[model samples]
Target: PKEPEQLRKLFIGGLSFETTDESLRSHFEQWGTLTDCVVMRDPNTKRSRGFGFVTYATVEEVDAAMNARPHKVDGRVVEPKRAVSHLTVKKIFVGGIKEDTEEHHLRDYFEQYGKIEVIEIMTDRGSGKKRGFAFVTFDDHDSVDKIVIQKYHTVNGHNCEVRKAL
Candidate 1:
């Protein structure tokens, strides 16, 4: 299957007020040729918006920019990530978890629904015991969809709501 080509526009954040278009363009130009770069400005105050978009000429440049992770420019460390309208975050909020429910049992119970990338059963910071809830994360939504069904939703013999996490 072919995946959609990643966008070359990056959402660069953590910009200092002193950041300028010339500085932004010069800094990112090392990764690849920049087709466009702009440090958003406050129309009212005429100050930097503390964020900006960097557009590269190629998708490979965009990937390279994202992989760069962190960049220091204009006296601030910047977060370089591809810009997107929204994110598809697939996670589950499993409540009514038994007090003694361990991560192993939780993983086992939820395994049938889908592949779990990360699962955490919350615990008390002081006593370090089960908090009666857990957050299960998955890379694919298929498992989350399956687990939320009524038939496979109960845990520890008690009915619980397997709701989406955010």
Candidate 2:
């Protein structure tokens, strides 16, 4: 974990429900080279939860990105927060999943709605099988709202719940 002073990354929280990772990168690139950027989302529905992380190669770049427009990514505004640790997740919790589901399939299913950061299928450690639940992380909150309105519970043969992670 990098200390705040050593932080080459910045946490972008309270993102708007319309921003994308690419859009975010484009917006932040004005500051410096972006090592990576991700918008967190739900696993099953693949919706953006409205927060993301932007990593730069240097503290100078991070500071520049932070100072840009008071932390607005694209047109959405974010509150400046300490960089999140690697284990910290900004994702939507998805429930009511099929046991046969795979991460890629889950991701593909949700990708139709928007860009997904990560799809994780929770499983029973004993059996190593799907636990009928999963998480879908999106690039931003805007993406989460888009998928919720367009695809939540609309997927054929599956009725899943989507909620922002606390």
Candidate 3:
């Protein structure tokens, strides 16, 4: 399946510095179930960074919450906009792969997510032995998303690590 154009997260700005995670969550929860709600903080001071982010469990919930616009929280009006991203990842790095693992093995295991374009199992040039890591490229990034949801893969009795390739 192709990626959907739905969003499930929002960026909240102009927040009162006094707002806490619980306060942000309490307000947004009135609209829908939330998966994540947090007030951005300054690392050193551990105080509100003047903004926060809220993530709903589904796009529909986000839609409902946004429809009730002009959200007022902590006695201040906050701006809520779709959390936009410019990143795209169609490749994933698989680590902790077992020695003697083959490209086809990785391909077969990951193919359940989406059509794979390439599977490269790293090898040592000197000894030609599997380096216990690999890269899998999918035709569609949505496949990467599926793979990441369950980032641990058991292949040939080995627990392999899977993550976006950055």
Candidate 4:
């Protein structure tokens, strides 16, 4: 079988506030059998998170769904993109880092999740200063989820944005 679970997952965004697991699933089912479908929601208020993930039973189904692109659900326009293969890729992009933040400072904060193997901070070519972004690679793939699920990070008093590196 050519199917791999990681390649079957898609990242869906621009969801309506009224969208639910059923609505989301019913829309994507046109393309193929969905192994998993969910509209992320807030834990406390049970509110829609405006984005969700879908997994197909096979990789071909994912391609068909993506090929059909520019989806709409719950009467609102929606977009779908392939999710990063977190199964093998452990690198995550960190943005909004302050210029003064040091590598060790980030290490001190992120090490709580898992062992980091690499931290590449983008720097200005001329000034050799921080470019407000960096890439963090963790030894364990699970670490990427632990860091990304929280969405934002407060490191050295700067609100940093965290995302799975494409």
Candidate 5:
């Protein structure tokens, strides 16, 4: 479907640790239909990160919400604004791979997370040996946060580490 003809995206901040998607939505939907509303939280700890994004069905709704500035929710006045365009992913680092693993294996492994742009295993220069690590790129920037929260998660049972690529 085509995006509604208004600035439907809003960045909401100053959320109380107790605030939740339900609370945020209830507070904002009073303005208009919301395509999406969330309270960003830690994937592992599952705690509010104090900010999140809200997508209204129209731009006017966003303006009304913003104009209602100093929105009090959970006992705190909040600020909402047009969310800056975000999410551009180039690559993500995957380390501690089982040295014998192949690119196809990495692709199959990481696909569950999101659409992968590319996958490669770093190799030695002289010997061309597996470098015990790999890199997987996700088209979705949010994928990294999901991957990162599983810090102790392993790749190919190698106790892998994931990070953003240079």
Candidate 6:
């Protein structure tokens, strides 16, 4: 048997504003033996902060729950990670891209390191030209690290920064 502290716990964020502890308990119980589930709320306004945690009786249960659902709740998407994974670059902001830069070029550059799930380049409303910036999203955590380490600065003459997307 595993020690008590060896049991796995999962932290779930991006809960709906209206979610409650009871709701979380009922929802997650379908996944496994849940030790605890709580929806955090703002103390003053009593509104959900859209975050919470779930503790499972075993590591296997935690892993099952982690893979069971899409990274979304209440029609919104949430980022999922193992409890041990630390945040790297959840989102990459590429600025100073040439006005005519294409989305595929950006994806080609970053996709070499990881899976590129989405690449959105802003465009001017008037001329429909590139807005000199774009957002890149990776499907997994390690991919983010690989791209950050390998290609974060590979783009020439451009300013780029990786930041946690809100």
TM-score of each: 0.51, 0.45, 0.49, 0.51, 0.49, 0.49
Per-residue lDDT, model 1, residue 49, is: 87
Per-residue accuracy of model 1 over 1-166 as CA lDDT, tens digit each: 3223335687788898898899999999988988889999999998988998888888668656655656888878986655552343579898887796677877778876556889888889999887789999986653554355344466677676777788
RMSD of 3: 10.4
lDDT of 6 at 93: 72
Candidates in order have lDDT scores of 0.74, 0.66, 0.80, 0.82, 0.73, 0.67
> How many Å off is the CA of 11 in candidate 6?
1.2
What is the TM-score of candidate 6? 0.49
List model 6 lDDT by residue over 30-103, tens digit each: 77888777788888998888888878888667657666767556666655444542564556776768686677
When summed lDDT is taken over every stretch of 10 residues in candidate 4, the lowest stretch is 80-89
- Whole-model lDDT, model 6: 0.67
Candidate 5 regions exceeding 4 Å error are: 1-90
Scored against the true structure, residue 126 in model 4 reaches a CA lDDT of 100
Model 6 bad stretches (over 4 Å)? 3-7, 88-139, 142-166
lDDT of 3: 0.80
Give the best candidate by lDDT.
4
Better-scoring candidate (lDDT), 1 or 3: 3
Cα error, residue 103 of model 4, in Å, equals 42
Q: What is the lDDT of residue 138 in candidate 1?
A: 82
Residue range with the least summed lDDT across 10 consecutive positions in model 2: 81-90
Question: Residue 6 in candidate 1 has what lDDT?
Answer: 37
